[PDB]
Design a protein around this nucleic acid. Structure first.
Ligand SMILES: [Mg+2]
Ligand SMILES: [Zn+2]
Ligand SMILES: [Zn+2]
Ligand SMILES: [Zn+2]
Lengths: 137, 47, 45, 113, 263, 66, 49
RNA sequence: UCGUUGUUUUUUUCUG
């Protein structure tokens, strides 16, 4: 009933094996001339409502360096928004999708149209053909 | 246990000689994700 | 202390999170974080 | 994600024996062998040998499910011999056959080169 | 009783005739050769630095597949069960490669040859990547342009093809018997006739054709198999043959030991 | 993208044969002849040398980041 | 969810009451539900995705 | 020191 048996050794030799690229986009948001949003690693004491994941892979500058490994529920970007009135900072992180895993490949950092810091993260991983996949002649 | 989130290797078992990082350390059984595949595995604190 | 790289000149440098985000040598406006020093492994499978 | 490890196919875990034997009550002098970490490569070879013996009444096996690497072998010899004796006899005979084949092939290759 | 008759031999391949043995025996031999003949291949790649246009996993995979001279691998213990914390030099071999293109032009071609054994349980003849000839550069690993560098530190281990196809020493094992179908194990699909549409096997000469008036024989059994063997070069064909035989023998010995020890 | 290492189907090494295949091609020999001289009989392999598209050289044409 | 547990099982759209029955669970590896080829008929289902 | 929360609204191209 339109289901097909594929040689396992063909897979092991890399048959139909494929790459996979995912990009995450974020930027600083200016909530005021004196009030803006910053990229950085938050501290539990100085911030509230932190994500259940872990931030350890974050750098001191608020980003994650390429060539490191990531996984689901892993905070790849640390952004903190000032709380409108210490302990006046709230998270604005960009956790990786809980159902995806890969290796951080290339981080792009620049300024948006408005001069605010502008970031992009591209994770990559390989998708091994397996049971349940789809193929068609 | 303040010894979490530090890279750890394995010495005995089926995954001997593989790198990894502790994820959960409830006690007596560490779940360290493997860097080579996209999987996590448990292993006691002795290995 | 964080290493960086440009997209045209490709000359490394670093920032202290305070310098405006531009290339120090050719003034370009695009930069990438350089590869980390930690080790990478693969099953080669 | 839910893929089974490739090293689990042949490295038998300690808690489970390589081979498990059971009796078959429905008929006399019949046993059921539960193998582990094996496939047709061994089962078929053993079956072909055991079928040739005269004192073996019923020899059979089946790879229950390919996603699990093990097979079960049903063997019943006539009352004269207990099945286990026939099994070990077959194993020894096959080992001897293989040794003879190796000797002959070594000779042939040596003269060939 | 079993007989062998090698027809054409060579370092990488063998075309032999094996007769007077159960079809099960020959087929199990083929399977064991294809599957359970331990050899040595790369099993951990650490990229200390890469700048090529190829994903790290891509290069790791390509490395995994390169054939290694695994002649004495029989003498290397399984890293899984080796007692040493981490990997000793007796449960693993370490290969290192680092090639870099320089100059604004041209394109370097990192070849398998560039791999260089660093350690290994010497003087065991294992680890060196296989080469067709003296000058054969070997496999093509990657291409590098200006200002592109590659630094990897591979690892190899002894594993069976069951775990992964990279440990397979046999390329393709031909197999056949009764080229004239005298046993009638097959019925030949045909539009007009079975003979004038079906090409004959290349061994048709080696056996007499069935006579026209001959009657079917029902007690006849397959008796002659015409199996060819090839290897990647990681092991000599004859060594592969002997090693598969040894593996089958010792597995059966293990089974017998378990049976007797059940009591 | 780059010539494969082994023939998915069987396993015979083919990767190293790409350069020789090209070389034989430049001097006018038809593809069938080139494959024959390389001793590629089982078409399970021949399909690869015959029908590989080389893309890495296209990738190189981009000035590297570094 | 251990072996032998009874679990409902449905396919959308569920035209007629045979379009959803209760099966017995048997945990297996890999990431696809598996069925006996016969019981597709009522589900009007095929393994093409 | 357990605890521990993450948008709507449309439109779109898709799957059976
Ligand atoms: Mg359908
Ligand atoms: Zn620049
Ligand atoms: Zn060791
Ligand atoms: Zn092939």
């Amino acid at each position: 009933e339109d289901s097909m048996i594929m040689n396992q050794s063909s897979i092991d030799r890399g048959l139909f094996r494929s790459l996979f690229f995912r990009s995450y986009m974020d930027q600083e948001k200016r909530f005021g001339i004196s009030i803006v949003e910053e990229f950085e690693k938050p501290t539990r004491a100085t911030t509230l409502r932190l994500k259940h994941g872990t931030y350890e892979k974050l750098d001191e500058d608020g980003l994650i360096a390429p060539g490191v490994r990531v996984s689901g529920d892993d905070i790849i970007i640390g952004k903190t928004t000032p709380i409108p009135p210490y302990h006046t900072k709230r998270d604005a992180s960009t956790p990786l999708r809980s159902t995806e895993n890969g290796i951080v490949d290339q981080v792009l950092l620049t300024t948006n149209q408005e001069g605010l810091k502008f970031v992009k993260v591209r994770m990559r991983t390989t998708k091994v053909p397996q049971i349940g996949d789809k193929f068609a002649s | 246990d303040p010894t979490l989130n530090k890279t750890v290797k394995i010495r005995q078992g089926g995954y001997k000689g593989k790198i990894g990082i502790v994820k959960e350390a409830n006690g007596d059984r560490f779940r360290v994700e493997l860097h080579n595949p996209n999987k996590t595995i448990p292993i006691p604190c002795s290995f | 202390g964080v290493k960086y790289t440009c997209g045209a000149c490709a000359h490394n440098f670093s920032l202290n999170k305070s310098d405006p985000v531009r290339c120090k040598e050719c003034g370009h406006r695009v930069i990438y974080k350089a590869r980390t020093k930690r080790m990478i492994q693969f099953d080669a499978r | 994600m839910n893929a089974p490890d490739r090293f689990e196919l042949f490295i038998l875990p300690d808690d489970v024996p390589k081979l498990k034997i059971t009796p078959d009550s429905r008929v006399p002098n019949c046993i059921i062998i539960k193998f582990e970490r094996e496939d047709h490569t061994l089962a078929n070879l053993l079956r072909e040998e055991l079928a040739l013996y005269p004192d073996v009444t019923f020899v059979a096996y089946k790879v229950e499910h390919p996603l699990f690497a093990n097979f079960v072998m049903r063997l019943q010899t006539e009352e004269g011999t207990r099945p286990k004796q026939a099994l070990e006899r077959a194993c020894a005979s096959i080992i001897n056959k293989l040794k003879t084949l190796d000797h002959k092939f070594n000779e042939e290759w040596n003269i060939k080169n | 009783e079993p007989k062998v008759n090698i027809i054409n031999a060579q370092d990488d391949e063998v075309e032999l005739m094996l007769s007077d043995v159960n079809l099960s025996l020959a087929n199990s031999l083929r399977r064991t050769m294809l599957a359970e003949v331990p050899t040595l291949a790369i099993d951990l790649v650490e990229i200390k630095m890469n700048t090529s246009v190829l994903a790290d996993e891509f290069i790791s995979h390509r490395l995994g597949l390169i054939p290694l001279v695994s002649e004495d691998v029989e003498e290397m213990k399984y890293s899984r069960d080796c007692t040493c914390e981490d990997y000793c030099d007796e449960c693993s071999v370490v290969l290192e490669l680092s090639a870099r293109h320089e100059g604004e032009e041209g394109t370097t071609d990192v070849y398998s040859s560039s791999l260089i054994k660093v350690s290994g349980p010497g003087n065991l003849n294992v680890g060196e990547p296989v080469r067709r000839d003296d000058y054969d550069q070997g496999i093509l690993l990657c291409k590098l342009r200006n200002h592109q560098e590659l630094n990897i530190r591979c690892i190899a281990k002894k594993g069976i093809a069951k775990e992964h196809a990279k440990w397979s020493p046999c390329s393709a094992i031909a197999f056949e018997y009764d080229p004239h179908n005298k046993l009638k194990h097959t019925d030949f699909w045909f539009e007009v006739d079975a003979k004038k549409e079906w090409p004959d096997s290349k061994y048709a000469t080696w056996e007499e054709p069935p006579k026209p008036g001959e009657v079917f024989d029902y007690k006849a059994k397959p008796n002659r198999f015409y199996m060819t063997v090839e290897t990647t070069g990681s092991l000599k064909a004859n060594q592969v043959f002997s090693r598969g035989i040894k593996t089958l023998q010792e597995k059966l010995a293990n089974v017998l030991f378990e049976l007797e020890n059940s009591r | 993208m780059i010539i494969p290492v082994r023939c998915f189907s069987c396993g015979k090494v083919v990767g190293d044969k790409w350069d020789a295949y090209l070389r034989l091609l430049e001097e006018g020999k038809q593809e069938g002849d080139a494959l024959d001289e390389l001793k590629l009989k089982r078409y399970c392999c021949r399909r690869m040398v015959l029908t590989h598209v080389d893309l890495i050289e296209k990738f190189l044409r981009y000035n590297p980041l570094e | 969810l251990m072996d032998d547990d009874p679990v409902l099982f449905n396919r959308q759209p569920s035209l007629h009451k045979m379009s959803m029955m209760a099966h017995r669970v048997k945990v297996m590896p890999y990431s696809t539900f598996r069925l006996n080829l016969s019981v597709t008929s009522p589900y009007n289902a095929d393994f093409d995705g």
